[PDB]
């Protein structure tokens, strides 16, 4: 909870693949400060420079019915405090009632310009499938898993907003991780291996373009990995 900000409470999640895609796609699910009918819940998704209400995200994931959305966010319908705290975001995002419309909304808010709604929608769909909460899964048909996790994130934001839970301490070392030589060299090796495959791609491209074979022994610039690790550690 930032004292000086437009948001009262912010539930973030630096998401990363179990053992790949080192860049940690940070996703935020914030609540607008009381200062308007109620308190609105939004989500600063990656590759999008504009906040989006959670309800659009849930509908873009294939859960259009508001009952299904609440079933994913609030697990106990016997909590009228929870319904009253989630009501403003629902009332603020109801004109959208289909997955395609929600995806188009996301694609319209995406950093990339929506030259065509089709590309725009596809842009979003792949963002919600790859960038949003990658640790939960980047494959297809996992929208249920992503919906449940985002619902739990909203549940955590509501528990913090209603005070039934304590805010998380940024200094608690149980909430920290130590990147040792292993993960550090792994991050460098990944980026440098990518650069190596890049140089090999360009080499083989400019050779096959002449209609002839190419030698990987000559394409593989071993100096990339060698001098890279050497420079970083030096």
């Amino acid at each position: 909870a930032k004292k000086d900000s437009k948001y009262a409470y912010t539930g973030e999640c630096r998401s990363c693949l179990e053992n790949s895609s080192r860049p940690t796609s940070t996703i935020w699910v914030s609540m607008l400060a009381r200062g308007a009918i109620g308190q609105r819940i939004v989500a600063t998704l990656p590759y999008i420079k504009q906040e989006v209400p959670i309800i659009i995200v849930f509908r873009a994931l294939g859960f259009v019915s508001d009952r299904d959305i609440l079933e994913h966010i609030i697990y106990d319908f016997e909590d009228p405090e929870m319904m009253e705290m989630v009501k403003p975001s629902l009332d603020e995002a109801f004109v959208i009632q289909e997955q395609n419309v929600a995806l188009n909304f996301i694609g319209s808010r995406g950093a990339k310009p929506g030259v065509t709604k089709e590309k725009r929608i596809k842009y979003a769909k792949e963002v919600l499938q790859k960038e949003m909460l990658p640790h939960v899964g980047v494959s297809d048909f996992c929208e249920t898993k992503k919906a449940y996790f985002l619902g739990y994130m909203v549940h955590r934001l509501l528990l913090a907003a209603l005070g039934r839970r304590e805010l998380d301490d940024r200094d608690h070392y149980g909430n920290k991780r130590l990147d040792l030589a292993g993960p550090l060299l792994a991050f460098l090796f990944r980026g440098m291996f990518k650069n190596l495959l890049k140089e090999v791609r360009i080499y083989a491209q400019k050779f096959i373009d002449r209609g002839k074979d190419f030698n990987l022994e000559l394409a593989i610039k071993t100096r990339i990995i060698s001098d890279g690790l050497k420079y970083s550690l030096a």
């Binding site: 019915s65 319904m83 304590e166």
Partner: protein, 117 residues
């Protein structure tokens, strides 16, 4: 009084919004997507408890008795089963300034009784 719960439509499972029958002057809950309507039964559409009269005994759960880090005492036995041992803890919940009140839970299995002194 009590809070007011959300009513969901039976066709599209969307939320029903309050509306009035201008001709009959009666409260209805109508769906903003389809043309469904329901006759209200509470007549109240909004309740905000500013004083926050919350009974924390409802937030407490019997499972807290299994926490080894909580203090135990033998001076307050359980009234529902008579068990002597019982864990006690503070509210520690935000929006409750007078949190020094102690809440007890019975450590007996299958009892899970909760109370306050």
């Amino acid at each position: 009084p009590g809070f007011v719960g959300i009513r969901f439509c039976q066709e599209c499972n969307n939320m029903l919004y309050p509306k009035e029958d201008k001709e009959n002057r009666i409260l209805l809950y109508a769906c903003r997507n389809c043309d469904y309507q329901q006759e209200a039964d509470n007549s109240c559409i909004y309740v905000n408890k500013i004083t926050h009269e919350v009974d924390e005994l409802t937030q407490i759960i019997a499972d807290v008795s299994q926490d080894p880090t909580l203090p135990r005492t033998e001076d307050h036995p359980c009234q529902k089963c008579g068990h002597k041992e019982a864990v006690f803890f503070q509210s520690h919940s935000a929006r409750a300034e007078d949190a020094m009140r102690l809440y007890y839970v019975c450590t007996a299995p299958h009892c899970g009784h909760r109370w306050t002194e």
